[PDB]
Write a protein that binds this ligand. Structure first.
Ligand SMILES: Cc1cc2nc3c(=O)[nH]c(=O)nc-3n(C[C@H](O)[C@H](O)[C@H](O)COP(=O)(O)O)c2cc1C
Length: 362
């Protein structure tokens, strides 16, 4: 077994390869999109993970697409996250913040000024996001048609990622993960399905990847390349965003570009919850030969699949999502071959302590 052996992940050393995937739980305070001590307790419970990757966190108020998702743009958010990271560190854990802009997976009612959310192009996501009703409970609501960003707005978006990274470093995170997956803003630019622009940010794969690579360069400059990871979902369809008619070649282009920056890790979200065709081993080999940082695999993994792919030299670590919701001590359970706690999906999104901090350890 290799899952319980250490791994250098850029600037930090994980004691094992069992990572906590980023999981949106929608329990932040409004007004202010503020993390809470309850969230702190939840993360502290999971500190034995090789690496915790936080729930997706707004780089700016405009970035918001979900009621209850936290930000990392305001003083009050910075202060609240500082307490959370301190708690994880007191338990000898490591925690990365996943930073997003939701782009068109959003609703005007939660945007600044009540305005349409932004994207690469003015095309509805044709999906839902999560708002809160009058009692503060999560509700699914159809997405608002976005406004296409003007060319002169792009530097501001890059700066918002840069600023959020400055704030994340201050807040005590060990790493940052850029959310370039699952049909959110960066992926909206990457995908031809959502990007119909005819300027330098659309058309060719070079142009479609331009924004994400500008963001990577800006955040490496703000902090250090060995503090930066990126999550992609570049093969298949996620929240109605496919990866276009040349998905493999386009993915390999992006990955070769990322490699030039010497970033800490590449996190591949391989499938959504409904599943689909597995990655070919040929594709995994092509990725592996092009990227020289850590590769994290995710999407309905088992420990056995993770061991197989680590043993084949194709990935370095695995991120578990739902098993981490339900098992604060997932590392010990996988090490001991213990049963896993029964998941309660009704409390994944929104609410309070129930279904959040009340899953027991062994
Ligand atoms: C409730 C829930 C929230 C999620 N939130 C995020 C998120 O904030 N960021 C992200 O990149 N993926 C998110 N995902 C996807 C998970 O990180 C993970 O890739 C997915 O659940 C599949 O892995 P699993 O089979 O181990 O759960 C979420 C998944 C679930 C079920």
């Amino acid at each position: 077994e290799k899952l319980f052996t250490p791994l250098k992940v850029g600037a930090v050393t994980a004691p094992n390869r069992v990572f906590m995937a980023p999981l949106t739980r929608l329990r932040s305070i409004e007004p202010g999109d503020i993390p809470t001590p309850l969230m702190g307790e939840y993360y502290r419970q999971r500190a034995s993970a090789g690496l915790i990757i936080s729930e997706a966190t707004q780089i700016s108020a405009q970035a918001k697409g979900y009621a209850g998702a936290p930000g990392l743009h305001s003083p009050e958010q910075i202060a609240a996250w500082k307490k959370i990271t301190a708690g994880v560190h007191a338990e000898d854990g490591r925690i990365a913040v996943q930073l997003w802009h939701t782009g068109r997976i959003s609703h005007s009612s939660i945007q600044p000024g009540g305005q349409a959310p932004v994207s690469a192009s003015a095309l509805n996501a044709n999906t839902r996001t999560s708002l809160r009703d009058e009692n503060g409970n999560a509700i699914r609501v159809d997405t608002t048609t976005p406004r296409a960003l003007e060319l002169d707005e792009i530097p501001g978006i890059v700066n918002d990622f840069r600023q959020a990274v400055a704030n994340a470093r201050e807040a005590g995170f060990d790493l940052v993960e850029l959310h370039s997956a699952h049909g959110y803003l960066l992926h909206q630019f990457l995908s031809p399905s959502s990007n119909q622009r005819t300027d330098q940010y659309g058309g060719s794969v070079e142009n479609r990847a331009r924004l994400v690579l500008e963001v990577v360069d800006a955040v490496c400059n703000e902090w250090s390349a060995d503090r930066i990871g990126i999550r992609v979902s570049p093969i298949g369809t996620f929240q109605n965003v496919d990866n276009g008619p040349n998905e493999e070649a386009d993915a390999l282009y992006l990955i070769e570009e990322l490699a030039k920056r010497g970033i800490a890790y590449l996190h591949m979200s391989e499938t959504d919850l409904a599943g689909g065709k597995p990655y070919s081993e040929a594709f995994r080999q092509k990725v592996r030969e092009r990227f020289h940082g850590v590769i994290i695999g995710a999407g309905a993994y088992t420990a056995e699949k993770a061991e197989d792919l680590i043993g084949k030299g194709l990935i370095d670590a695995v991120a578990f999502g739902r098993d981490y919701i339900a098992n604060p001590d997932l590392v010990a359970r996988l090490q001991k071959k213990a049963e896993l706690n029964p998941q309660r999906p009704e409390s994944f999104s929104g609410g309070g302590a129930e279904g959040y901090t009340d899953y027991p350890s062994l």
